[PDB]
């Protein structure tokens, strides 16, 4: 009661100091010095491919680094690897648990990860010599469902869980190398930096955090949103990122200025954002929505510059190729669509 | 160049051939979400009836898969969105043991009015009926301290009771049923239904009730297509 209240008031004064420093380092808004830049005009992307073959809703998807092969996870119990140029199914792996919520694709192209409501990350080997695709490893140790997972290389993987912690695993041994704690809600997404040194995590506490991977500690905290954060993605250069939340708003947070620079929202938009991504140059911010549509935002002028309306259910996942040529979308109507 | 094209087409053909069998087996099973309010002792009935447990049963050669979440955290507004395509949410209500009845009512009201579960039907099993029976027969374990409007409530001239019952136990059970049906009927946002029942560790034919209720759910889902 006594020490507790002294410590709470010390924390509140520290919050006041931090907010005062943030406001001190803020002198001009982003849209105040970029107002005269020429707009992107109109972005009219249309559907090139449509990948059929899933039976249930698609929860996740991940492009390969060769910008040709795509992975997708459906809640029917399937992990399908497509060749997007010819729309051929290269692989169809059956999962032990039907409730997969995420999937990843190693930057070498050898392995595939998937996890879900079983609190386990299964690692499958794709390039087995004279064999099929079988479970290479099973990473267990989380206490809640897996919401996201990304490879760092063929040996390390970072996973977000519903038990409010992130974990960095070594795949060979199968043990948690590092545990990232600090969030007070379900971590819903994560994003690796252009290099593999830092990452960002967004949770259901309306807060995002920056984590140094090599140490295991939280660098900074960003508290702009006012509801659950569902998606997060780094700006291409690595000195900013963007988040989408359930309050029907996207935000662009800065890493060196330590605040949010821009807000992407409207009045006819009252649906939450499910996924966000950046184009190769970083000028376009694509965001999927609960209203079955996707929006292309001018990341520097905060004007919406196009729509991707081709889905009949909730747009669940969104991904731009590493060369910036296509945009894959996956929805709850069991279809993957490539736009260009 | 051309040979890789043809080998890729062959691999895709084999993949599709297996996906057809998978689609055949997938449409035949019915997935049910067993969602107890907690502390409901429903482990006993799911015995007689680590992140998620699965229970398979079969009625009239129809296969049902019932899922129960195990090692999940307390908050459930995110992982429950996975169960919108489920054919039925089985909701086990720990009626007497307390204010757990109000917590079950609030959970049911949140599931009923959710945007994504707005098309899923709920099969409502009010478990632990005999515990409540002796509780209200004793005249000591009262629920009116939590529901003051319990008095002034009369069992209708309808609602046939069991001959091995007391008017007051029937009164309490129908009070709970109407408390849930108030929430069930007050909202028309989703085209879904609620099938309330009564059960305990005494009635072992609950899978027949689940079978009939899923049959009715599927009938009313088919009956939708003939309209616009």
């Amino acid at each position, epitope marked *: 009661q006594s020490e507790l209240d002294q410590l709470r008031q010390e924390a509140e004064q520290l919050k006041n100091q931090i907010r005062d420093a943030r406001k001190a380092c803020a002198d001009a808004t982003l849209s105040q010095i970029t107002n005269n830049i020429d707009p992107v005009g109109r972005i009219q992307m249309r559907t090139r491919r449509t990948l059929r073959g899933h039976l249930a809703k698609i929860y996740a998807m991940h492009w390969g680094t060769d910008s040709r092969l795509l992975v997708s996870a459906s809640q029917d119990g399937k992990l399908i690897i497509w060749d997007s140029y010819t729309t051929n199914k290269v692989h169809a792996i059956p999962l032990r648990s039907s409730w997969v919520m995420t999937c990843a694709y190693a930057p070498s192209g050898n392995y595939v990860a998937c996890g879900g409501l079983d609190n386990i990350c299964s690692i499958y080997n794709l390039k087995t010599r004279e064999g099929n695709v079988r479970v290479s490893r099973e990473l267990a140790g989380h206490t809640g469902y897996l919401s996201c997972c990304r490879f760092l290389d063929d040996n390390q993987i970072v996973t977000s869980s519903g038990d409010t912690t992130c974990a960095l695993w070594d795949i060979e041994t199968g043990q948690q190398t590092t545990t990232f704690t600090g969030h007070t809600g379900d971590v819903m997404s994560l994003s690796l930096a252009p290099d593999t040194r830092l990452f960002v995590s967004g949770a259901c*506490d309306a807060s995002a955090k920056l984590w140094d991977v090599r140490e295991g500690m939280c660098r900074q905290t960003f508290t702009g949103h006012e*509801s659950d954060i569902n998606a997060i993605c780094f700006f291409p250069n690595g000195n900013a990122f963007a988040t989408g939340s359930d309050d029907a708003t996207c935000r662009l947070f800065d890493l060196r200025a330590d605040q949010e620079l821009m807000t992407y929202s409207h009045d006819n938009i009252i649906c939450g954002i499910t996924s966000v991504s950046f184009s190769k140059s970083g000028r376009l911010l694509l965001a999927g929505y609960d209203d079955f549509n996707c929006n292309v935002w001018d990341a520097l002028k905060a004007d919406r510059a196009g729509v991707l309306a081709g889905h009949d259910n909730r747009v669940s996942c969104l991904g731009v190729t590493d060369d910036g040529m296509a945009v894959a979308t996956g929805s709850w109507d069991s279809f993957l669509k490539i736009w260009n | 160049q051309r040979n890789e094209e043809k080998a890729q087409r062959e691999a895709n053909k084999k993949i599709e051939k297996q996906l057809q069998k998978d689609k055949q087996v997938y449409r035949a099973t019915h997935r049910l979400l067993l969602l107890g309010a907690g502390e409901s002792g429903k482990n006993t009935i799911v015995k007689q009836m680590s992140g998620i447990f699965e229970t398979k049963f079969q009625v009239d050669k129809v296969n049902f898969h019932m899922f129960d979440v195990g090692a999940q955290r307390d*908050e459930r507004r995110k992982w429950i969105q996975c169960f919108n395509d489920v054919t039925a949410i089985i909701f086990v209500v720990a009626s007497s043991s307390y204010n757990r009845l109000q917590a079950a009512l609030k959970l049911f009201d949140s599931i009923w009015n959710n945007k994504w579960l707005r098309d899923t039907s709920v099969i409502l099993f009010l478990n632990k009926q005999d515990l409540l029976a002796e509780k209200v027969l004793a005249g000591k374990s009262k629920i009116e301290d*939590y529901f003051p409007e319990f008095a002034r409530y009369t069992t209708p001239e309808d609602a046939t009771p069991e001959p091995g019952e007391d008017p007051r136990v029937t009164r309490a059970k129908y009070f709970i049923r109407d408390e849930f049906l108030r929430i069930s009927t007050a*909202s028309g946002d989703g085209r879904h239904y609620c099938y309330p029942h009564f059960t305990c560790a005494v009635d072992t034919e609950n899978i027949r009730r689940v079978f009939n209720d899923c049959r009715d759910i599927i009938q009313r889902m088919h009956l939708r297509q003939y309209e616009l």
Partner: nanobody
Amino acid sequence: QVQLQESGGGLVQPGGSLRLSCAASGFTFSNYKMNWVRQAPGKGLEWVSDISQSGASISYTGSVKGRFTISRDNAKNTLYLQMNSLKPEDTAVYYCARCPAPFTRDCFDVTSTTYAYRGQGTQVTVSS
């Protein structure tokens, strides 16, 4: 930053009166359903009352119907609970909860043990 500050708790005699207030900052107060929950000594969190975005729909738990009255003012973003004719079963820590999504009619996790959009609570002891 979503901030909720409760005020007005304290000691009261049986049959007394109180008025808990809840000041909200960091979000559009007009878009969310609001709730009053409570935790009694030696028990768990239980729901007490809730009010919609306007005030047209208002609900109470059983043991407070007739006595408590919930209200909200969107002009200054404040939530009020007027507690009348208290009794020793009302001794608890009261919390002002906001349910997570705007423009919705459902509020899932306001009673969970580690909910994020809850306040710190005010103590209300009814003694003699």
